[PDB]
Amino acid sequence: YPHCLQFYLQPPSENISLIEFENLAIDRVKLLKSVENLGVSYVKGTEQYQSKLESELRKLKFSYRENLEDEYEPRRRDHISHFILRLAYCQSEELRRWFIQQEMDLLRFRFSILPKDKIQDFLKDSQLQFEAISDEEKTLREQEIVASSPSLSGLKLGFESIYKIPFADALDLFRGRKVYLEDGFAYVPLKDIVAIILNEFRAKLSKALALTARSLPAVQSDERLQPLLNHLSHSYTGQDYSTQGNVGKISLDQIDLLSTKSFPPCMRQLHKALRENHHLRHGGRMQYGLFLKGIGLTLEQALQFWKQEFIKGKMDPDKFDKGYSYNIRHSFGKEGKRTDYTPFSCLKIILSNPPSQGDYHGCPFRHSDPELLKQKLQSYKISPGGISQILDLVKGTHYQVACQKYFEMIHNVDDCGFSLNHPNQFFCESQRIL
Amino acid sequence: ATPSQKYNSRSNRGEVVTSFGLAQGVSWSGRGGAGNISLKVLGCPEALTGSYKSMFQKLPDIREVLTCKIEELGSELKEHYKIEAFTPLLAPAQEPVTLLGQIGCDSNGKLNNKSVILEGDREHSSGAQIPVDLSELKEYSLFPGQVVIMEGINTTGRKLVATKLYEGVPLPFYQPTEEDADFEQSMVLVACGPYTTSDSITYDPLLDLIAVINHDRPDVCILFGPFLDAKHEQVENCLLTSPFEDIFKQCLRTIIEGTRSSGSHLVFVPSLRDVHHEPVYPQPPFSYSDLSREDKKQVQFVSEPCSLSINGVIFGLTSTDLLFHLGAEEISSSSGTSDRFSRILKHILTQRSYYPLYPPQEDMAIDYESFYVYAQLPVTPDVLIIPSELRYFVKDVLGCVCVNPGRLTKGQVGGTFARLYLRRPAADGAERQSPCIAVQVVRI
Amino acid sequence: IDIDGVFKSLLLLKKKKYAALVVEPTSDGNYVTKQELKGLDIVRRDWCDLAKDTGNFVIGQILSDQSRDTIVENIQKRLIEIGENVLNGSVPVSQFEINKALTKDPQDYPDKKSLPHVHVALWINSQGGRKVKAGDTVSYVICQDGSNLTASQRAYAPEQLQKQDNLTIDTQYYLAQQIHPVVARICEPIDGIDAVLIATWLGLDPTQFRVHHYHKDEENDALLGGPAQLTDEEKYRDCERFKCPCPTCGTENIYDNVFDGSGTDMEPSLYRCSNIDCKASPLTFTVQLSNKLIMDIRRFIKKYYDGWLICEEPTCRNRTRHLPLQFSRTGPLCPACMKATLQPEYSDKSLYTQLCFYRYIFDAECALEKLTTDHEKDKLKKQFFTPKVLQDYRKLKNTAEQFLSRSGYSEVNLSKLFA
Numbered sequence A: 001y002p003h004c005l006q007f008y009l010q011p012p013s014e015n016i017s018l019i020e021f022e023n024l025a026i027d028r029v030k031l032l033k034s035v036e037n038l039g040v041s042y043v044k045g046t047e048q049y050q051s052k053l054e055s056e057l058r059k060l061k062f063s064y065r066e067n068l069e070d071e072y073e074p075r076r077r078d079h080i081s082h083f084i085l086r087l088a089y090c091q092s093e094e095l096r097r098w099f100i101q102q103e104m105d106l107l108r109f110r111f112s113i114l115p116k117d118k119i120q121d122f123l124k125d126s127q128l129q130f131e132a133i134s135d136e137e138k139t140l141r142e143q144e145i146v147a148s149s150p151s152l153s154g155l156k157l158g159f160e161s162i163y164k165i166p167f168a169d170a171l172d173l174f175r176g177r178k179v180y181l182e183d184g185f186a187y188v189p190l191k192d193i194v195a196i197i198l199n200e201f202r203a204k205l206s207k208a209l210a211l212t213a214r215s216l217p218a219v220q221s222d223e224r225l226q227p228l229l230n231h232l233s234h235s236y237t238g239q240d241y242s243t244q245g246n247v248g249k250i251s252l253d254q255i256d257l258l259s260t261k262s263f264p265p266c267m268r269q270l271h272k273a274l275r276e277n278h279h280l281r282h283g284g285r286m287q288y289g290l291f292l293k294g295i296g297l298t299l300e301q302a303l304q305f306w307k308q309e310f311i312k313g314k315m316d317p318d319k320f321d322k323g324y325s326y327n328i329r330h331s332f333g334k335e336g337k338r339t340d341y342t343p344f345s346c347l348k349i350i351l352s353n354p355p356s357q358g359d360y361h362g363c364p365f366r367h368s369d370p371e372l373l374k375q376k377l378q379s380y381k382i383s384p385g386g387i388s389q390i391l392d393l394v395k396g397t398h399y400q401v402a403c404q405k406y407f408e409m410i411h412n413v414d415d416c417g418f419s420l421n422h423p424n425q426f427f428c429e430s431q432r433i434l
Numbered sequence B: 001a002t003p004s005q006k007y008n009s010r011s012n013r014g015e016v017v018t019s020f021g022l023a024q025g026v027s028w029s030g031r032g033g034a035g036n037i038s039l040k041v042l043g044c045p046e047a048l049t050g051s052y053k054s055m056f057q058k059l060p061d062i063r064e065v066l067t068c069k070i071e072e073l074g075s076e077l078k079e080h081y082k083i084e085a086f087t088p089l090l091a092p093a094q095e096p097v098t099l100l101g102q103i104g105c106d107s108n109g110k111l112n113n114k115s116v117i118l119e120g121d122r123e124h125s126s127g128a129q130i131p132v133d134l135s136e137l138k139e140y141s142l143f144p145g146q147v148v149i150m151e152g153i154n155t156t157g158r159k160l161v162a163t164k165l166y167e168g169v170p171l172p173f174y175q176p177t178e179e180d181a182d183f184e185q186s187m188v189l190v191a192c193g194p195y196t197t198s199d200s201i202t203y204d205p206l207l208d209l210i211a212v213i214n215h216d217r218p219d220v221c222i223l224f225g226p227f228l229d230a231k232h233e234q235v236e237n238c239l240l241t242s243p244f245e246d247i248f249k250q251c252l253r254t255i256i257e258g259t260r261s262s263g264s265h266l267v268f269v270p271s272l273r274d275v276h277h278e279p280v281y282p283q284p285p286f287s288y289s290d291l292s293r294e295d296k297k298q299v300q301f302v303s304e305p306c307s308l309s310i311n312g313v314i315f316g317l318t319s320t321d322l323l324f325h326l327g328a329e330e331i332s333s334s335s336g337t338s339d340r341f342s343r344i345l346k347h348i349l350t351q352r353s354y355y356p357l358y359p360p361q362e363d364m365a366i367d368y369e370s371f372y373v374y375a376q377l378p379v380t381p382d383v384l385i386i387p388s389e390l391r392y393f394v395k396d397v398l399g400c401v402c403v404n405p406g407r408l409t410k411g412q413v414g415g416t417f418a419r420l421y422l423r424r425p426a427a428d429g430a431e432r433q434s435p436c437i438a439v440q441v442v443r444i
Numbered sequence C: 001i002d003i004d005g006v007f008k009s010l011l012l013l014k015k016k017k018y019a020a021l022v023v024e025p026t027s028d029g030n031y032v033t034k035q036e037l038k039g040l041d042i043v044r045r046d047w048c049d050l051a052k053d054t055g056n057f058v059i060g061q062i063l064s065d066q067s068r069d070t071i072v073e074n075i076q077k078r079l080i081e082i083g084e085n086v087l088n089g090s091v092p093v094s095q096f097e098i099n100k101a102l103t104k105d106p107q108d109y110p111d112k113k114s115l116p117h118v119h120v121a122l123w124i125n126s127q128g129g130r131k132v133k134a135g136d137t138v139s140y141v142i143c144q145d146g147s148n149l150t151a152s153q154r155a156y157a158p159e160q161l162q163k164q165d166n167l168t169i170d171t172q173y174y175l176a177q178q179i180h181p182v183v184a185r186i187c188e189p190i191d192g193i194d195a196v197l198i199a200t201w202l203g204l205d206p207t208q209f210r211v212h213h214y215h216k217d218e219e220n221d222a223l224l225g226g227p228a229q230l231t232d233e234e235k236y237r238d239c240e241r242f243k244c245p246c247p248t249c250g251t252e253n254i255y256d257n258v259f260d261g262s263g264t265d266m267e268p269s270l271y272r273c274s275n276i277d278c279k280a281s282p283l284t285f286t287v288q289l290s291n292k293l294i295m296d297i298r299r300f301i302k303k304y305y306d307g308w309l310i311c312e313e314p315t316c317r318n319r320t321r322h323l324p325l326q327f328s329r330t331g332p333l334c335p336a337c338m339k340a341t342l343q344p345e346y347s348d349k350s351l352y353t354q355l356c357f358y359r360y361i362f363d364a365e366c367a368l369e370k371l372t373t374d375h376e377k378d379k380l381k382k383q384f385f386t387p388k389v390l391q392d393y394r395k396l397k398n399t400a401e402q403f404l405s406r407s408g409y410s411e412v413n414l415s416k417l418f419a
């Protein structure tokens, strides 16, 4: 581990515990998902993006300038975590494309982190040769570089470093006659340098991921890594943390106002459907019941609420008892865990059991068409421009970010200060707004 | 007081009960550490040079261990018996054709003569199973986990009937050399735990063995485990005031200091019943740090089981009570016609493995990959040591002579230990020339 | 690519083992709801006729065209009347009978103590006349004798039971292993339904039934957005607690947490013995606490290496140790169920979990990183956490850490994964 950035082409050969193995896998999955969501929400170059992702790195300790702390733990964490993601992600072309997008975002940000003094030794450590030119050479060949340069306006050849490269390394660059050539050597600004290195890095990663895809069947024989490595990205929440066992004071009568002021669109419309129908299908019923369990409602409050609502449902109260009260108590109590003991996370809500005719569960952004999304947004009184970028985000299949933007719009705020993954987190933050 | 009061009032103190070999005098002694004494572990990639690695089992590679052992034994017996070709267990042929597979019990209890099944290797019979019938078979001797070559008639496919069985030829004896003939006569101490009574910590039998050794001056001494057994009531109730490793180190240092004057070589065989050590058969040796240079030159530790050579004579050491384990479910057509001990030793020599029984009894813990790569007999041993809770005995079968040293302590009742002369006889002449001379089983 | 068939409703259970309403599109867009399914077969004939009737009712209700909620409500109500009828004894006695054949003679079975039908054969051959020969079918029923024996050790004959008023039948044993498996085999895969929930539906079982209940099929990575890595209180909730009698007073001591109490008095359990009258701190007896730890982790290692195998078809649940040489796609085929897959009773990772649970019990250093309020951390550590007691706790840690270091791929090597 000689430098912070590193190109990942030498797999580690150390020995680590299972707990550290899972910690690295989950931490790097969280980092890449955060990179995806932040890059979707913001522009890739803004200081807000830079500082927010720096804070994400600091809370996940994945990169920093060399010191006593950096040498042992963080860069090694980066190494093994990246390779276990290689194993997780080499399954499919779609996952490979996703991983490549996020790792290019990560590597470009990290390169922007590195100060200009250390980029020379980084390229030297990169094992592929590139020679920076001297100031005298730059001054002598400035006119040639400007004359042969791309549409960059003016003669200004600023502080940006210029390197010497074999011509075969920049084929697509020079083949447009937008660079000067000297004895088979090119001279290039920093933006095109990083473009070249990222293209080469994507080529090497594509080949390596294909090779690991050829190596998956042998390495999947293990039983303690199959159920994880099948689903690091597909169906794992990034520490949603809205686990059962929370506390709070909720008044049963206030449920309507709390639904219209603090519920994510899916749960809001589910509660309205319950109020207007006094009956739900299995999926929506279980979803809303365990959500109400999560928000802090106690067992007696939940039972009384559901019984009262089925009073308007017109079935026998003893039938209610025998049929459902067992199910609600089981959800609040004993095992059957991870399906009835837990509050549903957003990634689960979107990927599991899409609603059908007569169903109202499921995230509406992913499970209903844009015209009905627009109708619902009009019914919820959001500005037409806000609805416009909501639909733009829906076209970009970033449903969680769309829900985020809906949250700031309904709360009349700018940034929620997080990235939502759990409806109970949505509700907790809305209560934090008071 | 009343702890070990039998050992303070044992009439048979020093008396010898049984003997094998030649009528020999009683002044049993050795030349001390002086003289050329060889001591080398042998066979099956060197019986855990390192400590050990794992407790993670994979059912697939356990299966490949099983089928590999079955295939190896099948190939060896096919080449030795000039067999035409084996047949799949599910392929019915009317003419008597040979089969192959390891013996198992149909249910989960103790083996019964009519509750036995046959399951073969996958390359012959897809690893399937089939019940066997022994009513037609005249003589046999079966126990779970042994390879057999049953040329039974299977005209139906769903059940075979035994016609005649093939005994398994044992491994050839380890071929000696001239330097082996260049050894003079030597005698060995053997002793197995427990070294204290059921209600003591004093280790009076241990002191008695120290006295016996420093009075007799033997060549090499053998001490089997357990040293601090878990089944002891004083430890199972766990009233001890000192750590298990502390007590164990105290014990080892007591034996070491008690045999400084002996000069005889020393080695300890760990046992599954030992509490502080890893309960995984086969086991790594013990762990100890405080040794001087002469201590290292005089004391060793070996894995359990171990195949070690002394003066070019093969010693096969196993601590587990394999005799008792086999005797529980081994079956034969006749019981009183031959010796149960004789047939059990027949099986242990035949199956080429230090533990031929599968599945083992509850009070063991076998990791099968390590068992296959570390617990195979390299050769038919010259002499075997099997400390067993059953009665002490010494027999010789198929050239291999076996001594049961007995238990040094049976609760509070008197125990036994054994002495054996070994000496390489004339290099040629008779085809079989056992290094052993004579053995005494002498009560402690 | 092409279409091969239509199923109006399908119960996905296993490869070539499912229930599915076959739909053959007829003329004018109509279809016939043909009834076909794979894998419903049963291997052992030792079920009550009322149990078979209940299973047929379950399959009929799960194969009706109506909605999931309607089917669930019908099955739950019917299961409730079945449970109440069995509990109050209104069910006629003849339906409780169990039939079973005899492969061998009664004494020949090595598991005579565990097989109730061979036990009944022993009883009849002893007390009566005509012996039970191999190839004959024994008829018997379970009974409750008040002798706290195992159910298998209490099976009687129907006529003998009807002639005996002293001892009665065991509704608990039926609701445990004669009705619950038959229904649960089909009704369990339906989402939002678990064997614990059926137990609550049918009777007073839940607690003792989770005690005597298999939690192997419950695990499945089909959670499409559920767990990430869990927390301790649900990781170790299946791990057995730590036992130790107090040398001073002979009182049992319970430990499943580094600390003990609620809030201000959240002192470690080792500070005070569970006995209120005991005045000696367990902190003195670190030697024999470590000895007990060595002993019971030794017992757990022995239990795992025992290599006990269980058939995962809930009806069979064959308990055996001989790993069969036959081996299917998923694992070792059941020698009794020619279509099944075995797996250990005590998982290797289950033992890993329990040993990590022990190191969690004794890892005061990590437990000091979970209470957020640093002021409380400081006052508690100054009032009780001396360096001597921390060294004792660290010794307790190492007592299990020196097994965990060599423990069964609790560490993973990267070379064979990246080769």
Ligand code: SF4
Pocket (backbone or CB within 6 Å): A264, A265, A266, A267, A345, A346, A347, A349, A350, A362, A363, A364, A365, A399, A400, A403, A404, A421, A422, A423, A426
């Ligand atoms: S993103 Fe999650 S919380 Fe928001 S509406 Fe969709 S499922 Fe609900």
Ligand SMILES: [Zn+2]
Pocket (backbone or CB within 6 Å): C246, C247, C248, C249, C250, C251, C273, C274, C275, C278, C279, C280
């Ligand atoms: Zn006490």
Ligand SMILES: [Zn+2]
Pocket (backbone or CB within 6 Å): C311, C312, C313, C316, C317, C318, C334, C335, C336, C337, C338, C340
């Ligand atoms: Zn089965």
